[PDB]
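#struct-pred
JK: can someone run the complex with 88Z? inputs below
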Amino acid sequence: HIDLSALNPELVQAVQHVVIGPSSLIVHFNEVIGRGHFGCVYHGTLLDGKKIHCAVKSLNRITDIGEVSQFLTEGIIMKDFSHPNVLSLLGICLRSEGSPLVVLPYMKHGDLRNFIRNHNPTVKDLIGFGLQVAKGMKYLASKKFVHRDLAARNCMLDEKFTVKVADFGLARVMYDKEYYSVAKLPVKWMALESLQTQKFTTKSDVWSFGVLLWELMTRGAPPYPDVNTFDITVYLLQGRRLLQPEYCPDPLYEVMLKCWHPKAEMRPSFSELVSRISAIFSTFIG
Ligand SMILES: COc1cc2c(Oc3ccc(NC(=O)C4(C(=O)Nc5ccc(F)cc5)CC4)cc3F)ccnc2cc1OCCCN1CCOCC1
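RT: done, structure tokens with the ligand placed:
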């Protein structure tokens, strides 16, 4: 029962250009994919009559203008992302009654963190996943887009094992709650300057990317498990970094240390990371 007239008109216009008519979408409400504090994800079918399997993102409540606007804004930020390693938007379904729905292509293997924690990807496969993230990030950084929450939990994996960089945003699943701490920030993925200023850049996405490579090489271990969330800045400032994983090649560990350079301006670009990781990947048989 949303009132579009009370929302930002430029936002509503943007939503209308990617609109999905309520009749083209079948939402299977009994087929829940995920549940969170602010939103839920269901299986869906989008209709030449060809059926497209999709994921349908909804808000739990439609009473707050700020939450509704943020929800639509999240969907709109995605509309022009067109890259094999970035999650795309199928459209937004505005209904007469209930939450607007953000429609995403269905990702067979779910999120990358759950995938690597579950299958037996080789070390080359895991490095390949990192290279795919770096390509998706090289594309976003070229559009001057700052992610702010790069982590394996925000990367999706389709049926061809193609990694799609994404952000659950308001559809954040309840199991992910421990990784965010008081605004709720993903402190164990954040760069030192961002922990101190709460300001984000492509260079702070690079720090997060190094943490994501560590997640990959450990097959989804939680980073800094013995550090209290509010003490991470003190821990890092003692002169510490995540340790080299057993199956992490030395050149890949060196790349991680470069991603965590204390000076943001000295961290490698995503363009350099794609180049460096392509080379390391190529050394493995498969
Ligand atoms: C939780 O499980 C799943 C969630 C899925 C899904 O969820 C979302 C992901 C991202 C967004 N993002 C968004 O809503 C937004 C976004 O992504 N923006 C954005 C931001 C930055 C960027 F670079 C790109 C995109 C906020 C708009 C929204 C979603 F609803 C979308 C598609 N397929 C999914 C499949 C899932 O499991 C499949 C079943 C897996 N099983 C296999 C067998 O056993 C294991 C489990």
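RT: quick notes.
The domain at 107-286 is CATH 1.10.510.10 (Transferase(Phosphotransferase); domain 1).
The pocket of 88Z is lined by residues 33-34, 41, 55, 57, 74-75, 78, 81, 86-87, 102, 104, 106-107, 109-110, 114, 140, 147, 156, 165-169, 171, 173 (CB under 6 Å).
JK: thanks, will look after standup
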